[PDB]
Design an enzyme around this catalytic site. Structure first.
Site, short mmCIF file in Angstrom:
data_model
loop_
_atom_site.label_atom_id
_atom_site.label_comp_id
_atom_site.label_asym_id
_atom_site.label_seq_id
_atom_site.Cartn_x
_atom_site.Cartn_y
_atom_site.Cartn_z
N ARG A 169 -30.15 13.02 2.51
CA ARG A 169 -29.70 14.25 1.87
C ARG A 169 -28.57 13.98 0.89
NH1 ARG A 169 -27.14 16.61 5.09
NH2 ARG A 169 -27.63 15.50 7.03
N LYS B 123 -34.24 21.75 4.69
CA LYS B 123 -32.90 22.12 5.14
C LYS B 123 -32.32 23.26 4.32
CE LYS B 123 -31.54 19.98 8.88
NZ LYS B 123 -32.43 18.88 9.29
N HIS C 166 -28.93 24.00 15.30
CA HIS C 166 -29.41 22.69 14.89
C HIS C 166 -29.66 21.87 16.15
CE1 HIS C 166 -28.83 18.69 12.63
NE2 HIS C 166 -30.07 19.12 12.49
N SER D 189 -29.34 14.09 13.25
CA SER D 189 -30.48 13.20 13.36
C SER D 189 -30.00 11.77 13.59
CB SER D 189 -31.40 13.31 12.15
OG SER D 189 -30.80 12.76 11.00
N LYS E 207 -31.92 13.72 19.51
CA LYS E 207 -32.55 15.00 19.83
C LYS E 207 -34.07 14.96 19.68
CE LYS E 207 -31.64 17.43 15.46
NZ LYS E 207 -33.04 17.24 14.97
N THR E 208 -34.59 14.22 18.71
CA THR E 208 -36.04 14.10 18.59
C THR E 208 -36.61 13.32 19.76
OG1 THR E 208 -35.99 14.22 16.18
CG2 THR E 208 -37.93 13.19 17.19
N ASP F 113 -35.74 20.47 15.62
CA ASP F 113 -34.59 20.45 14.73
C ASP F 113 -33.93 21.80 14.45
OD1 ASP F 113 -32.93 18.75 12.85
OD2 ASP F 113 -33.86 20.04 11.32
N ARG G 147 -38.67 7.97 7.61
CA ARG G 147 -39.10 9.22 8.23
C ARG G 147 -40.61 9.33 8.28
NH1 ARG G 147 -34.94 13.40 9.75
NH2 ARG G 147 -33.09 12.22 9.11
#
Length: 535
Positions: free
Chosen positions: A60, A208, A227, A245, A249-250, A264, A328
């Protein structure tokens, strides 16, 4: 389903070929067109998924994020230039907005365009209808994966609330004299209800932005906007995992003993926790079929790989981070068998997990938080930004990311905290702080240990377990935990010299105290100081 004349209302001219609501079959054929050049190009991997590259735009661009300051946003947005707290909500003039809009609409004029209509939000009463416009098939594919795909009946009555125009192929040559950060831009106008993308090819910019819009609208009507990833146990018990990220969490969401709600972006309303997305944009660095079988098996036709290394024979080297560590893949959520259907939502959360990638090796692998500590640590958001996740981040970078998602907040952090607390109180939910970062030696905490910790949280075995208290941070740590080496539970034990924990803990405690000071301008915030670390 969409006429050329309809696009002219957005400023786009000279368009006669529109690919509306492209099917996955069409996108696959288009992505493999050998006439594509540069960052449009796609290749087919041995897993059956197309792979693309995004050049230097491997994460980002927060420094290029701008929001028009006008009568719609002036008094409600959390501006970067008006508060004690740093954020990326940089104000933009209506005049400069018109310049950027002109750049993008001129870029897309005269082109064959893909238009994807989709929803952000699983629930009709609070979802945004979003119309995405691109000149690149794989960008349309990304948004087809990541947003909720409407039925034909829903497309028949589709009325966009927001337009997202991807003009990655254009840049802004006037950026210096306009006081902007670079020739690139990710700009939002909440009066025109439009997002513009210029210069940057990173796929995440296309999802996002709408997350930031949900983060503006939902808390204002009492709905948490979070989030986090989310999953549900066999008995209907929901857990949410807050974090940036790369901090687990994934990976933890796809727990095979649970069923996936989302990766997410989630809301929490009167009925429960609901996904905003139609897919998952998972990090793939060091991915392996043995360690992450559900995610790995989601990589097949209709997934879209981004910046992974593809060998000459079409196989993928998931371990290669030489383009970027922030490789990704996106896939529609149904590429995971073990998901909630027919809609990605379930009941209230009973367990709230804050993932902290602590690079100081100070915090315990797991702590059970008090109610005030929950608010304190949610506002603090101490964790780390991992390499590549934002452009220019080259190594784990400690950060205080309010609400574990500061980069996406459109309102003040306390507005998210107050709604989350109200939802947790109504549910009787318990919160845990889990260190997915590093230990006192500098070694990354193992995913096997973190998975065992999550197991012990989710089966309720920690809620009333015996604890000891960590000095300074005053965190309650379980005295033992099935399937984990008892010695790792106390963060002091992994130091070659335990006195060094004291030094690093004092340093981190001071960082927390200084970061939290800005929230003490209300009685409630001042009262939370007692729940933070104390020197």
């Amino acid at each position: 389903g969409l006429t050329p004349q309809e696009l002219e209302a957005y400023g786009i001219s000279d368009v006669h070929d529109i690919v509306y609501n492209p099917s996955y079959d069409l996108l696959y054929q288009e992505e493999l067109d050998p006439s594509l050049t540069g960052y449009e190009r796609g290749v087919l991997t041995n897993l059956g998924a197309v792979a693309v590259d995004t050049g230097i735009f491997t994460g980002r661009s927060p420094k290029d994020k701008y929001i028009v300051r006008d009568d719609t946003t002036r008094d409600t947005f959390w501006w970067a230039d008006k508060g004690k707290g740093k954020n990326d909500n940089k104000p933009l003039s209506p005049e400069t907005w018109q310049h950027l809009k002109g750049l993008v609409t001129r870029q897309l004029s005269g082109k064959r365009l893909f238009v994807v209509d989709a929803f952000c939000g699983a629930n009709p009463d609070t979802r945004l209808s979003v119309r995405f416009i691109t000149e690149v098939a794989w960008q349309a594919h990304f948004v087809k994966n990541m947003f909720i795909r409407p039925s034909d009946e829903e497309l028949a009555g589709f009325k966009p609330d927001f337009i997202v125009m991807n003009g990655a192929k254009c840049t802004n040559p006037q950026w210096k004299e306009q006081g902007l950060n670079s020739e690139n831009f990710v700009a939002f106008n909440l009066t025109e209800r439009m997002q513009l993308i210029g210069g940057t090819w990173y796929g995440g910019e296309m999802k996002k932005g709408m997350f930031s819009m949900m983060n503006y609208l939902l808390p204002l009507k009492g709905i948490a906007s979070m989030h986090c990833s989310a999953n549900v146990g066999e008995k209907g018990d929901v857990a949410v995992f807050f974090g940036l990220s790369g901090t687990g969490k994934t990976t933890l969401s796809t727990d095979p003993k649970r069923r996936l709600i989302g990766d997410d972006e989630h809301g929490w309303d009167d009925d429960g926790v609901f996904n905003f997305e139609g897919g998952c944009y998972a990090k793939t660095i060091k991915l392996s079929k043995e360690a992450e079988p559900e995610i790995y098996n989601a990589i097949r036709r209709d997934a879209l790989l981004e910046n992974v290394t593809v060998r000459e024979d079409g196989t993928i080297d998931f371990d290669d981070g030489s383009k970027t560590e922030n490789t990704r893949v996106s896939y529609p959520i149904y590429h995971i068998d073990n998901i909630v259907k027919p809609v990605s939502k379930a009941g209230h959360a009973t367990k709230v997990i804050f993932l902290t990638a602590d690079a100081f090796g100070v915090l315990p692998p797991v702590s059970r938080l008090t109610a005030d500590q929950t608010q304190y640590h949610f506002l603090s958001g101490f964790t780390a930004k991992l390499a590549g996740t934002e452009r220019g981040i080259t190594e784990p970078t400690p950060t205080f990311s309010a609400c574990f998602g500061a980069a996406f907040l459109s309102l003040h952090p306390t507005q998210y905290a107050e709604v989350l607390v109200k939802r947790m109180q109504a549910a009787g939910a318990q919160a845990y702080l889990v260190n997915t970062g590093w230990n006192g030696t500098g070694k990354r905490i193992s995913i096997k240990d973190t998975r065992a910790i999550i197991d012990a949280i989710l089966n309720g075995s920690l809620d009333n377990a015996e604890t000891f208290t960590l000095p300074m941070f005053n965190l309650a740590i379980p005295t033992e935990l099935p399937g984990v080496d008892t010695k790792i539970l106390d963060p002091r034990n992994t130091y070659a010299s335990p006195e060094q924990w004291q030094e690093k803990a004092e340093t981190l405690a001071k960082l927390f105290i200084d970061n939290f000071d800005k929230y003490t301008d209300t009685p409630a915030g001042a009262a939370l100081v007692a729940a933070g670390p104390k020197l």
